[PDB]
């Protein structure tokens with residue numbers, strides 16, 4: 001009797017999809033890099049006085065798992081396209097992810113948020129806020145900056161904001 005939303009987290013290997021997801025669910029930061037194939041996590045939560053069930057699908061960034069990722073992506077109600085602000089290649093691959101989502105959902109637009117992660121690494125940052133916002137605006141999608149490292153920045157907000165975007169549908 002509650003709406004269920006499948007929230008799919010995509011992006012290049014190592015950008016922090018799992019760290020964001022784990023902060024969201026467990027409120028801890030994982031320091032180890034253990035590559036994901038596919039994991040799903042469920043919680044009941046209340047956003048703006050309205051309860052929902054969230055199934056968060058944490059996908060593989062490693063390109064060897066791309067066939068399986070595409071299949072899991074089909075089921076999505078909304079997407080976080082995550083890059084790392086310390087990894088220029090991950091930012092340049094945002095287009096590939098944008099194209100992919102629209103293809104797998106067979107639509108001209110779809111609920112998604114561009115997520116610029118690892119902003120706590122201010123001395124290693126390579127992609128500017130202006131660059132990120134420009135990329136998001138090109139696709140007419142929201143833009144938000146995050147850090148999964150303690151103390152986390154905008155983690156809960158990002159997932160909640162994706163739900164807000166889905167609720168516009």
Ligand SMILES: Nc1nc2c(ncn2[C@@H]2O[C@H](COP(=O)(O)OP(=O)(O)NP(=O)(O)O)[C@@H](O)[C@H]2O)c(=O)[nH]1
Pocket residue numbers: 011012013014015016017018019020030031032033034035036037059060061062117118119120121146147148149
């Ligand atoms: N400083 C900092 N490190 C982060 C952040 N997010 C992730 N990391 C670190 O970056 C590494 C990769 O994170 P991880 O969440 O595994 O990335 P992933 O995108 O899930 N990788 P995969 O696609 O292979 O599953 C880990 O060492 C993790 O601690 C962040 O916001 N800040």
Ligand SMILES: [Mg+2]
Pocket residue numbers: 017018019034035036058059061
């Ligand atoms: Mg992962």
